[PDB]
Amino acid sequence: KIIVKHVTVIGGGLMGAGIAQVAAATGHTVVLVDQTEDILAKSKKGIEESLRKVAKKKFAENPKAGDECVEKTLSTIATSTDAASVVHSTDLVVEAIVENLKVKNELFKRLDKFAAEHTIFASNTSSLQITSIANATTRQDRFAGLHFFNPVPVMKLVEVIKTPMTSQKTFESLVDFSKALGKHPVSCKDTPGFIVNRLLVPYLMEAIRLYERGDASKEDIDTAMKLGAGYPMGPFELLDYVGLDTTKFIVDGWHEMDAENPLHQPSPSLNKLVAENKFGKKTGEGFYKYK
Amino acid sequence: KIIVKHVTVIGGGLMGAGIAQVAAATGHTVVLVDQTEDILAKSKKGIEESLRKVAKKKFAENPKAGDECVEKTLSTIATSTDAASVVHSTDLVVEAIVENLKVKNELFKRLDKFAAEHTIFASNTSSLQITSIANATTRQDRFAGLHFFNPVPVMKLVEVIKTPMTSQKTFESLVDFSKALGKHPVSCKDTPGFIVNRLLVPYLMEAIRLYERGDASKEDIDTAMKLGAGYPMGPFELLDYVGLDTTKFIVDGWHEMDAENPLHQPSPSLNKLVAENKFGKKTGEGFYKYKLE
Ligand SMILES: NC(=O)C1=CN([C@@H]2O[C@H](COP(=O)(O)OP(=O)(O)OC[C@H]3O[C@@H](n4cnc5c(N)ncnc54)[C@H](O)[C@@H]3O)[C@@H](O)[C@H]2O)C=CC1
Ligand SMILES: NC(=O)C1=CN([C@@H]2O[C@H](COP(=O)(O)OP(=O)(O)OC[C@H]3O[C@@H](n4cnc5c(N)ncnc54)[C@H](O)[C@@H]3O)[C@@H](O)[C@H]2O)C=CC1
Secondary structure, eight states: OOOOOEEEEEOOSHHHHHHHHHHHHTTOEEEEEOSOHHHHHHHHHHHHHHHHHHHHHHTTTOHHHHHHHHHHHHHTEEEESOGGGTGGGOSEEEEOOOSOHHHHHHHHHHHHHHSOSSOEEEEOOSSSOTHHHHTTSSOGGGEEEEEOOSSTTTOOEEEEEEOTTOOHHHHHHHHHHHHHTTOEEEEEESOTTTTHHHHHHHHHHHHHHHHHTTSSOHHHHHHHHHHHHOOSSOHHHHHHHHOHHHHHHHHHHHHHHTTTOGGGOOOHHHHHHHHTTOOBGGGTBSSSBOO | OOOOOEEEEEOOSHHHHHHHHHHHHTTOEEEEEOSSHHHHHHHHHHHHHHHHHHHHHHOTTOHHHHHHHHHHHHHTEEEESOGGGTGGGOSEEEEOOOSOHHHHHHHHHHHTTTSOSSOEEEEOOSSSOHHHHHTTSSOGGGEEEEEOOSSTTTOOEEEEEEOTTOOHHHHHHHHHHHHHTTOEEEEEESOTTTTHHHHHHHHHHHHHHHHHTTSSOHHHHHHHHHHHHOOSSOHHHHHHHHOHHHHHHHHHHHHHHTTTOGGGOOOHHHHHHHHTTOOBGGGTBSSSBOOOO
16 A cells, blocks of 8 residues: 655645645645635635634643744645646645536546646535546546535544445545544545535425425524534524525436435525525525524 | 422333432422332432432532431432322322333323322323323313423523413413423423424434435544534434334324424434334444443
């Protein structure tokens, strides 16, 4: 097997930046790739701010060390706008770009030609068949899914998705990498939603339908699941937290893929909110109003 | 508005005993009912041990204070083998007996004749229609669902279920009663599973199906839902904790009422474990094996 040490993270967004941060914090050499220097500048600025917010609490008694820890970590992250020039000798590519299949395949189709031989390709996609991306390359045995959770530097869970073509050597290498990141890896096949979303999303939809049906108020439903099932957030609070458009996107995906299943049936309420651009906390309004 | 002060709890099992315990601990006069004096003696004993357990943890700094507390609560809990003998002067009847429609209807049909005019009737049932049970009486305006969660003394939620016939006054009085118990009441129509089970159970079934399908292990699924969704228990640990039989029962009912619905298709693994009489922590084994206490 291979020991991941040099990591190429493509996409410096919410997830990408988090992945690059944890990898660098855990002693991996990292190259963050995005489209423009400005995007990268902002992504790396965000990483630094996050690292400092932590350090100020952990190195309160010794601020010098705190600053070093931060510097050392940032210096271990490099940036580039050209993935091709970076993967020649990288051990792992973790892609977290726009959730679009075409764009993704083109990206990997191209990288497969420049990446080293031992290089492993992994996607952090939520609503896309890992296999539907692996096939865009001739490296399916070194291709898998590595699904993280927001906020990456906080959430310890990582889903290691193995396709029917993924090597066992590749799998274990990702399992070892996950642990080196200080994460707790779980295994799942390349099935829609993998584990978490597959069981969480349809339940969130069910909560909306119960409400749309007029069986109870959103407030009581949230209170019920928090006090009755011990959940951290009620379904509607959580829905606004993960983004209503983000959810709709995943459900429609499963609806088209299987318009017969009652769990993926569209929701008038959900659609309306998204329509009128009310996506949740990231807009100040979803099922509830914030800020 | 008549404020519930005297409560008759019918059924001294897991749920009724807890309801009785909480009502008694919050200043309500209580009468616990069950088939025999032994069952009752044992139920009340389980309530004492539960009280003494919390006492030795709340009154560590003064064991005597704890003793007084426990004794006071325990004393406000009378016991009777026939509820008909005390409902003529009770404000609320909370039933928590075997989950069987006919047995429940028979019970309430008879009590309807002894209960004071103002007395409210409430069932803690998880799978039966409150309306079905209410129509066993001629007191539907004073009939409703009052659904608790195990362990009752700990779970703060209570679902107040209103049938199309339940009166606003009956509803409000149960809402006030819930708060008086120190619980947080939520409202729901008389629909299958009300709020919690309707959203929880189908999810547990999906968990089993994902596993049976072989997409992931039970262990990984539990880890994933705990770390990924922040749940206190993975679905399989929760299934064993609430009872596999208890779960299968609720689902067969929904499947029965709508056999074409995919959400209620039975689970081979679930039926098998239940068939092997492996009901979870109850029997020392469910999806996981537990250390026989
Ligand atoms: N939003 C979430 O909480 C989670 C999302 N995901 C998945 O992670 C991926 C990342 O989504 P987010 O970080 O939230 O989105 P984001 O939009 O915040 O970040 C994506 C980044 O990708 C860049 N990008 C787009 N196309 C590119 C290309 N061809 N080459 C290089 N960079 C490109 C964008 O400039 C942007 O900075 C998606 O595949 C999504 O399904 C996975 C788990 C959780
Ligand atoms: N077990 C659970 O977690 C939950 C159960 N429930 C519901 O609450 C009810 C209570 O169930 P559990 O406490 O679990 O069962 P249980 O079997 O532990 O207790 C039921 C008690 O009812 C008594 N009983 C049966 N027929 C009777 C009659 N005619 N008169 C008086 N007592 C009679 C039994 O002797 C027994 O002590 C059921 O309807 C159930 O669906 C509701 C919420 C949660």
